[PDB]
Each structure stands twice: as C-alpha cells, then as structure tokens.
Amino acid sequence: SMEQVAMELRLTELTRLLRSVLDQLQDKDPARIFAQPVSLKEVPDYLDHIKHPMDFATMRKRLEAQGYKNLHEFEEDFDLIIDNCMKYNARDTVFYRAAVRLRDQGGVVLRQARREVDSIG
Ligand code: NA
C-alpha cells in the first residue's frame, strides 16, 4: 500500500541521518576504542560483566539494515558503548577517559540530532 511506501521512505531518510550522525560521533573517538566488539578471545570474562555489549561496527550493521526505527533506539546503543565501558574499565584508565569524552562531545551532536529527526519526521 501507498501508506506503507511513505512509511518506508521515512525510515530510509532517518537511516541517512543516523549514518551521518554515526559518522560524526566516531570522529570524536578518532583512535578507535569503540570501533569493534570486544574480542571474547582477548577478554574471556567480559560477558560476566556486561550483558549488552555494543560498538560502532555493531551499530553500523544494525543501521544499514534499517533497524533503527527512531532516534531513541540509536541513542540506547551509543549510550551502551559509553556505559558498558565506564563500568568494566576504572577511572585512572584511559578507556573510561575515552568513553567520557565521546559522551561529552557526542552530546552536542545528540542534541543537534534530536532536533533533526524531529520536524523532519
Ligand atoms: Na567499574
């Protein structure tokens, strides 16, 4: 139906936005802590700590399938990269200190993404 096709193009334009939002946040992590899912060969106890792992590659695979139906679903995953990192890794670690700065600089993008999905609809 034409109502379904108008629904699908709207998703197709959200995805384009959430890609460009995704591209912007990964620049804030330039040396790539959060590029990849934590290796369960290098970190065999990780799933004892963190029940919902996330990373930019996982977020990009979800995105290109059109699996982000809104901006809230995208933010939960971005938040999960920051949040899981800041629990596993301690404060004097650069990992926590890299997660902190992605949050802080990623806020100015997620504020300036919230009001982009919005009116665009
Ligand atoms: Na901790």
PDB file of C-alpha atoms and ligand atoms in Angstrom:
ATOM      1  CA  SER A   1       0.000   0.000   0.000  1.00  0.00           C
ATOM      2  CA  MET A   2       0.984   3.649  -0.557  1.00  0.00           C
ATOM      3  CA  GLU A   3       0.810   4.217   3.236  1.00  0.00           C
ATOM      4  CA  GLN A   4       3.499   1.531   3.699  1.00  0.00           C
ATOM      5  CA  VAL A   5       5.780   3.009   0.974  1.00  0.00           C
ATOM      6  CA  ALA A   6       5.503   6.502   2.561  1.00  0.00           C
ATOM      7  CA  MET A   7       6.442   4.805   5.875  1.00  0.00           C
ATOM      8  CA  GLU A   8       9.484   3.090   4.301  1.00  0.00           C
ATOM      9  CA  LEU A   9      10.910   6.241   2.606  1.00  0.00           C
ATOM     10  CA  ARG A  10      10.640   7.989   6.011  1.00  0.00           C
ATOM     11  CA  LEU A  11      12.753   5.217   7.564  1.00  0.00           C
ATOM     12  CA  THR A  12      15.087   5.451   4.515  1.00  0.00           C
ATOM     13  CA  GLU A  13      15.663   9.179   5.330  1.00  0.00           C
ATOM     14  CA  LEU A  14      16.117   8.561   9.075  1.00  0.00           C
ATOM     15  CA  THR A  15      18.839   5.978   8.267  1.00  0.00           C
ATOM     16  CA  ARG A  16      20.692   8.534   6.101  1.00  0.00           C
ATOM     17  CA  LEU A  17      20.550  10.933   9.055  1.00  0.00           C
ATOM     18  CA  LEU A  18      21.613   8.297  11.650  1.00  0.00           C
ATOM     19  CA  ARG A  19      24.522   7.332   9.367  1.00  0.00           C
ATOM     20  CA  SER A  20      25.670  10.952   9.214  1.00  0.00           C
ATOM     21  CA  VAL A  21      25.136  11.252  12.992  1.00  0.00           C
ATOM     22  CA  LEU A  22      27.098   7.967  13.389  1.00  0.00           C
ATOM     23  CA  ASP A  23      29.950   9.219  11.181  1.00  0.00           C
ATOM     24  CA  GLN A  24      30.182  12.400  13.336  1.00  0.00           C
ATOM     25  CA  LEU A  25      30.397  10.556  16.705  1.00  0.00           C
ATOM     26  CA  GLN A  26      33.094   8.085  15.531  1.00  0.00           C
ATOM     27  CA  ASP A  27      35.322  11.119  14.741  1.00  0.00           C
ATOM     28  CA  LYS A  28      35.086  12.017  18.470  1.00  0.00           C
ATOM     29  CA  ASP A  29      36.677   8.599  19.072  1.00  0.00           C
ATOM     30  CA  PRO A  30      39.488   9.064  16.447  1.00  0.00           C
ATOM     31  CA  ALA A  31      41.834   6.261  17.599  1.00  0.00           C
ATOM     32  CA  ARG A  32      39.031   3.703  17.735  1.00  0.00           C
ATOM     33  CA  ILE A  33      38.450   2.096  21.196  1.00  0.00           C
ATOM     34  CA  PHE A  34      34.800   1.613  20.262  1.00  0.00           C
ATOM     35  CA  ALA A  35      35.213   0.642  16.578  1.00  0.00           C
ATOM     36  CA  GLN A  36      34.822  -3.101  17.220  1.00  0.00           C
ATOM     37  CA  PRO A  37      33.087  -5.583  19.563  1.00  0.00           C
ATOM     38  CA  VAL A  38      35.344  -6.568  22.474  1.00  0.00           C
ATOM     39  CA  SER A  39      37.128  -9.780  21.488  1.00  0.00           C
ATOM     40  CA  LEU A  40      35.885 -12.764  23.526  1.00  0.00           C
ATOM     41  CA  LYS A  41      39.338 -14.329  22.783  1.00  0.00           C
ATOM     42  CA  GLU A  42      41.271 -11.387  24.332  1.00  0.00           C
ATOM     43  CA  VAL A  43      38.626 -10.765  27.076  1.00  0.00           C
ATOM     44  CA  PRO A  44      37.150 -14.192  28.102  1.00  0.00           C
ATOM     45  CA  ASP A  45      35.371 -12.821  31.252  1.00  0.00           C
ATOM     46  CA  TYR A  46      33.674  -9.805  29.532  1.00  0.00           C
ATOM     47  CA  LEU A  47      30.155 -11.345  29.367  1.00  0.00           C
ATOM     48  CA  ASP A  48      30.332 -11.993  33.144  1.00  0.00           C
ATOM     49  CA  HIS A  49      30.368  -8.162  33.498  1.00  0.00           C
ATOM     50  CA  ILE A  50      28.435  -6.720  30.576  1.00  0.00           C
ATOM     51  CA  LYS A  51      25.142  -8.230  29.382  1.00  0.00           C
ATOM     52  CA  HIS A  52      24.567  -5.946  26.367  1.00  0.00           C
ATOM     53  CA  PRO A  53      27.848  -5.255  24.510  1.00  0.00           C
ATOM     54  CA  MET A  54      28.000  -2.576  21.800  1.00  0.00           C
ATOM     55  CA  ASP A  55      30.440  -0.825  19.481  1.00  0.00           C
ATOM     56  CA  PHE A  56      30.343   1.308  16.341  1.00  0.00           C
ATOM     57  CA  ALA A  57      30.665  -1.670  13.899  1.00  0.00           C
ATOM     58  CA  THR A  58      27.689  -3.429  15.516  1.00  0.00           C
ATOM     59  CA  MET A  59      25.804  -0.086  15.336  1.00  0.00           C
ATOM     60  CA  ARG A  60      26.682   0.323  11.629  1.00  0.00           C
ATOM     61  CA  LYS A  61      25.462  -3.209  10.718  1.00  0.00           C
ATOM     62  CA  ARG A  62      22.173  -2.544  12.517  1.00  0.00           C
ATOM     63  CA  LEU A  63      21.871   0.826  10.702  1.00  0.00           C
ATOM     64  CA  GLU A  64      22.347  -0.381   7.075  1.00  0.00           C
ATOM     65  CA  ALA A  65      19.594  -2.996   7.616  1.00  0.00           C
ATOM     66  CA  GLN A  66      17.245  -0.096   8.603  1.00  0.00           C
ATOM     67  CA  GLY A  67      16.978  -1.473  12.163  1.00  0.00           C
ATOM     68  CA  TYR A  68      16.827   1.924  13.896  1.00  0.00           C
ATOM     69  CA  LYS A  69      13.096   2.784  13.728  1.00  0.00           C
ATOM     70  CA  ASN A  70      13.690   6.060  15.679  1.00  0.00           C
ATOM     71  CA  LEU A  71      16.406   8.222  17.385  1.00  0.00           C
ATOM     72  CA  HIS A  72      15.766   6.671  20.838  1.00  0.00           C
ATOM     73  CA  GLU A  73      16.815   3.198  19.561  1.00  0.00           C
ATOM     74  CA  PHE A  74      20.083   4.700  18.157  1.00  0.00           C
ATOM     75  CA  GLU A  75      20.863   6.601  21.400  1.00  0.00           C
ATOM     76  CA  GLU A  76      20.433   3.496  23.601  1.00  0.00           C
ATOM     77  CA  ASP A  77      23.196   1.787  21.585  1.00  0.00           C
ATOM     78  CA  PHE A  78      25.516   4.848  21.635  1.00  0.00           C
ATOM     79  CA  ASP A  79      24.866   5.141  25.388  1.00  0.00           C
ATOM     80  CA  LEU A  80      25.656   1.381  25.769  1.00  0.00           C
ATOM     81  CA  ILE A  81      29.140   1.883  24.288  1.00  0.00           C
ATOM     82  CA  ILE A  82      29.797   4.686  26.826  1.00  0.00           C
ATOM     83  CA  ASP A  83      28.036   2.975  29.748  1.00  0.00           C
ATOM     84  CA  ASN A  84      29.487  -0.577  29.478  1.00  0.00           C
ATOM     85  CA  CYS A  85      32.983   0.912  29.008  1.00  0.00           C
ATOM     86  CA  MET A  86      32.733   3.074  32.168  1.00  0.00           C
ATOM     87  CA  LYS A  87      31.790   0.017  34.296  1.00  0.00           C
ATOM     88  CA  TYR A  88      34.361  -2.526  33.043  1.00  0.00           C
ATOM     89  CA  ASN A  89      37.232  -0.031  32.988  1.00  0.00           C
ATOM     90  CA  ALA A  90      38.252   2.019  36.060  1.00  0.00           C
ATOM     91  CA  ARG A  91      38.691   5.822  36.417  1.00  0.00           C
ATOM     92  CA  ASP A  92      42.509   6.275  36.034  1.00  0.00           C
ATOM     93  CA  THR A  93      42.207   4.172  32.840  1.00  0.00           C
ATOM     94  CA  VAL A  94      42.282   5.964  29.504  1.00  0.00           C
ATOM     95  CA  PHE A  95      39.320   3.690  28.425  1.00  0.00           C
ATOM     96  CA  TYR A  96      36.939   5.305  30.847  1.00  0.00           C
ATOM     97  CA  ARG A  97      38.635   8.642  29.967  1.00  0.00           C
ATOM     98  CA  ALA A  98      37.974   7.956  26.244  1.00  0.00           C
ATOM     99  CA  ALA A  99      34.339   6.979  26.975  1.00  0.00           C
ATOM    100  CA  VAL A 100      33.851  10.217  28.985  1.00  0.00           C
ATOM    101  CA  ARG A 101      34.934  12.410  26.034  1.00  0.00           C
ATOM    102  CA  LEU A 102      32.764  10.628  23.494  1.00  0.00           C
ATOM    103  CA  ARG A 103      29.776  11.288  25.781  1.00  0.00           C
ATOM    104  CA  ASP A 104      30.629  14.989  26.312  1.00  0.00           C
ATOM    105  CA  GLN A 105      31.413  15.828  22.656  1.00  0.00           C
ATOM    106  CA  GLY A 106      28.710  13.356  21.484  1.00  0.00           C
ATOM    107  CA  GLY A 107      26.103  15.294  23.500  1.00  0.00           C
ATOM    108  CA  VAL A 108      26.450  18.384  21.254  1.00  0.00           C
ATOM    109  CA  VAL A 109      25.776  16.037  18.284  1.00  0.00           C
ATOM    110  CA  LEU A 110      22.856  14.178  20.005  1.00  0.00           C
ATOM    111  CA  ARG A 111      21.278  17.493  20.984  1.00  0.00           C
ATOM    112  CA  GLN A 112      21.913  18.616  17.379  1.00  0.00           C
ATOM    113  CA  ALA A 113      20.480  15.252  16.174  1.00  0.00           C
ATOM    114  CA  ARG A 114      17.355  15.200  18.407  1.00  0.00           C
ATOM    115  CA  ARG A 115      16.159  18.421  16.775  1.00  0.00           C
ATOM    116  CA  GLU A 116      16.968  16.898  13.229  1.00  0.00           C
ATOM    117  CA  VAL A 117      14.837  13.725  13.206  1.00  0.00           C
ATOM    118  CA  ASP A 118      12.186  15.841  14.881  1.00  0.00           C
ATOM    119  CA  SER A 119      10.337  18.289  12.407  1.00  0.00           C
ATOM    120  CA  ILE A 120      11.810  16.185   9.548  1.00  0.00           C
ATOM    121  CA  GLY A 121       9.526  13.484  10.961  1.00  0.00           C
TER     122      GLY A 121
HETATM  123 NA    NA B   1      33.942  -0.134  37.403  1.00  0.00          NA
END
